């Protein structure tokens, strides 16, 4: 369950793609309680429900029961059916007990897990 709100939108039927200006995506759990908010400057939605997010991507947790609180990156890709998320850019994961930075990320909004792939630094270091 999700909602996608945006300002300008263009849909082109030949490519079957929508382009959104300032998308705000809200995902919801079994009971329609909002659980994640995802914002970006711009997004492209494909025919098979892959959301590509571009510019100032920000993922925020909306429930207290999540160790991962926030993710930021220049660009990210979400599958809206399985809730997988990826970024191939620099990423910052804000958690409950420390924050982390690295190059690239893979994760899932339904399990609430996210991992950085390379060059990983934490806020508690040194």
- Decide if 77 contacts 106 (C-beta within 8 A): no
Buried b (16+ CB within 10 A) or exposed e, 51-70: bbbbeebebebeeeebebee
21: tokens are 């200006």
For residues 66, 67, 70, 72, the Cα torsion angle rounded to the nearest 10 degrees is -130
Experimental method: X-ray
Question: To what resolution in angstroms was this structure determined?
Answer: 2.2
Smallest CA-to-CA distance from 44 within 36, 29, 55 is with 55
- 105 contacts: CB under 8 Å, gap ≥ 6: 71, 73, 76, 85, 86, 87, 91, 93, 114, 115, 116, 117
103 CB neighbour count, 10 Å cutoff: 14
- Decide if 23 contacts 7 (C-beta within 8 A): no
Question: 20: burial class by Cβ within 10 Å (0-12, 13-18, 19+)?
Answer: buried
List domains and CATH numbers for the chain. 1-126 (2.60.450.10)
């Amino acid at each position: 369950s999700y909602r996608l709100i945006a300002q300008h939108v263009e849909y082109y039927s030949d490519q079957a793609v929508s382009w959104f200006t300032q998308p705000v995506l809200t995902t919801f759990d079994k009971d329609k309680i909002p659980t994640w908010s995802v914002k970006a400057d711009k997004a492209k939605l494909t025919n098979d429900r892959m959301l590509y997010l571009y510019g100032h991507v920000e993922v925020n947790a909306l429930v207290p029961d999540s160790q991962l609180r926030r993710i930021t990156t220049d660009n990210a890709q979400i599958n809206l059916v399985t809730q997988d998320v990826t970024s191939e850019d620099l990423v910052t994961l804000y958690g409950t007990t420390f924050n982390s930075s690295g190059l690239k990320m893979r994760g899932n909004l339904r399990s609430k897990n996210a991992e950085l792939i390379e060059k990983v630094r934490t806020s508690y270091e040194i």
